[model samples]
Target: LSQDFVEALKAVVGSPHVSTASAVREQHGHDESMHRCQPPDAVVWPQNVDQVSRVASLCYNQGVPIIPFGTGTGVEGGVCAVQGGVCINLTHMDQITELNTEDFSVVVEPGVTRKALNTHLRDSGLWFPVDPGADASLCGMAATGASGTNAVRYGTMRDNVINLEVVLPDGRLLHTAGRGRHYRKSAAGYNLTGLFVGSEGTLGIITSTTLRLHPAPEATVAATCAFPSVQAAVDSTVQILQAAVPVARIEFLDDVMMDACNRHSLNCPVAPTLFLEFHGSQQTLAEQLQRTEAITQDNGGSHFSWAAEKRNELWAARHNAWYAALALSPGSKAYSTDVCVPISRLPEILVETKEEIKASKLTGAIVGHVGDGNFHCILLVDPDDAEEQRRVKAFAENLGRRALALGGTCTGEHGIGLGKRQLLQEEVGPVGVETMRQLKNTLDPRGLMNPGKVL
Candidate 1:
């Protein structure tokens, strides 16, 4: 531990506010994922963006790494303070700073949760669309470039984020996206707006954000369709795509995953299923439903399970898939892998992936944003079994290779914090990684921001 860091923190926030308790530090440094914790040397939960900026500048000057922490809901260990400096907890900076009803966007502090933003926008009928299952803080989600169930239609942070207020390592704050000035799209020089979206704090500290919003769906119809096998379900998904129905959300849950859902959720089904939602006028929705039902029926899907109660149960179960996966293995950890391919390859890719999982003899479940060709397999393993861990990792590696071979990325949403760092080079090539390394060196030469994340 650096005594100088402790002293400076004491001077900035006072000693009583700074904590070094092993348990508290352990909690702050770790994420909610299955990975083991690597606690920071100390923690400073700042009350607002100025204090956060001050903390970043202090740590940068001292050559002490700083990891930003929000809700710790990142699955890729993004919140880990592996180099043991100050984990800047942003929860205290929670505030809805501004709103623009005319332009359909809101300016908010990084610590504000999506639920809070939704509540704030409830009266305006404008909504920010990116939603991971857990209501993660907006700043953390933007840092990790998070996307979720709504991503199929609404898109992720990368798409919905119009502008952001970012704090540089030197403690200077600037707006890169939305404020008094706005753009429907950007053709500006280097896409600085994109540089920080999924950066996970490597480039700089995020102070506030401006996110694009959409009017809430006029009407929504959620439904599920069961198939005889994963292949059949995937085929129906292809048909839905070929039909060009405006699908709001489409998720796949294999038999094993569906079984896990039944075990955990009330009134859930245990069949390989496709959960879907449609958003539009009543006429448009009726047409989409007809097209979907016909395609599924042609592809060997069971009769449409569109009854309101049944559909609710199915989607509820699908949304709880991550928990169900953990529940599938009584006392094991899950290393979830996500990949996105061109929509054309989704069906065969999913089929081959299931075969690989079965051949590996690993107990796991498969579920994902199948509509966009992004999917994940929850690989369950006992962390104590070193040999088993290697084998499972190799399996994940091979799966990543398969995705790459089929022209997809190793990771679709989960950022390359530590687990996926090795694969980043292969996905983006040496030149791209070198450019990123150069950027890191130029902006954070002291290596004070999120060490051991991304490149």
Candidate 2:
């Protein structure tokens, strides 16, 4: 805001890293989401945790809003500078600080992305698997509490994060899991690590994060099965869960989504389908797939298919779902809705939502990580079409409320940012909202740390 403030930032991280150019600010503005861009007043690239703390301290002294940014791959506007202040881009702090293979843990800076981390660990026979469909920063993933198709068995970022090195609103460094300790489990204190895991850059700037890793599966197999209806496909997923088959990835694609896939790339049948992957020893996968086939057959699932990449054909379709859906309307933008429900209620919700989509005649396709009852509707609409936009907004609101009514959260992995503020109030009643507000007040009384997000 002042020349002194910019000078202070320049002093902390140097002049080159302190960017006030409008183009750079605009680039640091919003994420991949459709939220209107609100560029930061200035952008700073802190090379290390020390610099991050220094820059945060400078902003703290001036009471300037501080927005910590990652790769900005978030579908939510988590990185948007709502109040217009300083944006701390952390990609330059990319360092694999530590790797404790015996403990199945690794420590990394905020800049390290999921794919980059995995690539670094390629020869180590280890992998970190909490994917949110984007090559997002590991710390960013932890901030958003990201998960993807693998979440069914591997768990989300909340489960994978062992410790965090955070810079508080006042630039005080706080180690969530006791200073320099990376214990897998501890009853030591109040569990601050869990609190900061999904704080979404609201509580602090996570400079370094220690993440849990799992050994790469020895044998993996992928499969796809078509169902007569959405209910049947959803039922097969739940049934697979009940059977204790330990499926690594179980994704549900509605008939329309399958049709999009056919038009885009693969030769999938235009029907409600489930894409499944199994992980275990070769002989064990055989037993798992055998039992899975029986379950699908019993549920009237047909066009059974399997692949061994064995990961190529089946999972490629899952990864390209967004692009495939987009190809339907080249000029339209997408608004993906995330609503997760209890497993048993998945069928009821999925069936009803399908009928509603058909009735509304919206150009949207439904997909889900059904293993955990998390699903999304990738809706494509012309940005200028007000009537169509209204319908999409209405449909998403109803879907959010619908999930809550069935004992689910408004969003499963995506945290509350620019959108879903009212839904947050509805999802968590007045008392719940008040408690969260109280916590935020305690941590950031100035309301300068990523203001207007997750409150």
Candidate 3:
């Protein structure tokens, strides 16, 4: 650690808040990505926006890299501190400040966990429904513009977020939304909300957010349907989307994945199935169930029926699929690959990708948010085996290339942190990437915010 740098951080956050201790620094250094770890010089816990502004301002003036740290669930190395500067952790700042039921919005600090919000909203007869499977901080989810099974119906964080209180790189606090109560489009100025929605902390640090909420559904129903083949299951998904059935969640789990769930999670039924969630009035849900039943049966799907507990268990298993894949291999790690294509081309892409994986002789599992045309191919392998790692990487790369060939994205929800930085140019094209770089440069000229992430 540099003596001069340590002294500067101490001056800003005081000696109590500044630390060069390896443990805290290293904890902030690593993330869930496959990238190598690089510990930060220090990790500072800021309890409020003022403290955040103080730390950011100090770092900005010192020309030091300042990485915003959320709950650290990011799978793309978004929170890894490669630049060795201050990691402004928001864990201490978490607090739910307001619940404006009249306006259907909630104000919260950046560190508040999604589970916390959901718990608080349990009695409000309202819900914030941007779920990313695991319980991640709302700020982190917003930064990545995260989406999951619910995105097919309720949309991602981008759709739920209505206002933001941001601390710019230079320490100027800006409030971008929630000026009044009504929800309406604006053309008054640049859409700062759009710019920051998925900036991955390169633009600035978000202090607080006002998120839109929806009235809790009076009735919810989930079900599962067994299909003859993956093709039949995927065809059913297409038909559902085409019919505009208003299904809240439509997910697919291939036979291998179902086996994993049955073995480990024990949540899913022991069958290749499509999981479904229907939300709205009882009558509306019944109609949705009827529509989905006819669609799946028409596509050669069988064992089509409804069971609330069984359906919950299926989705519970689906959410923990990454861990299940690991356990399925007994002593191996899991490499998760994802791609999203236009709904019309998803069946073709899935067929081709499935054939490709089968030809590789890899024991992979397929699970998908089929309503959004996004799916993952999980390759389980021993991390210690060089050959296995090579095969997994090759498979992941090939899958991404296939997604591009089909006019799809390399990553559907996970943002382009360090993991997908190289693939950005290929996915967005050199010119498009250049434009993004220009925007980044314009917003953060010194690049002190989240360096070595999301290029």
* Top TM-score model: 2
Candidate number with the higher lDDT (1 or 2): 2
Question: What's the distance in Å from true for residue 275, model 3?
Answer: 0.9
Write one digit per residue (lDDT tens) for candidate 3, span 91-151.
7778887688888888878778888998988888998887776778788777888888888
Q: Write the per-residue lDDT of candidate 2 for residues 1-455, one digit (tens) a residue.
A: 78988998999888999999999999999787766689999999998778988988889778899999999987778888989999999999889967998989999887788888998999999999887766789998888888889999999989889999999988899998877788767898699998988789999999889999999999888878999999899999999998888999999999999999878777877899998888999999989988999999988998458674546656666777887888899977777888999999999999998999988878889987889898989888787888887888888889999998988998888888877788889999999999999989998989999999988
Location of the lowest summed lDDT over 10 successive residues in candidate 3: 176-185
Clashes of each: 2, 0, 0
- The lDDT per prediction is 0.82, 0.88, 0.81
Clashing pairs in 3: none
Off by over 4 Å in 2: 308-310
TM accuracy, model 3: 0.94
Candidate 3 lDDT (Cα, 0 to 1): 0.81
On a 0 to 100 scale, what is the lDDT of residue 251 in model 3? 88
Indicate the worst ten consecutive residues by lDDT in candidate 2.
Answer: 308-317
In angstroms, give how far residue 132 of model 2 lies from its true place: 1.7
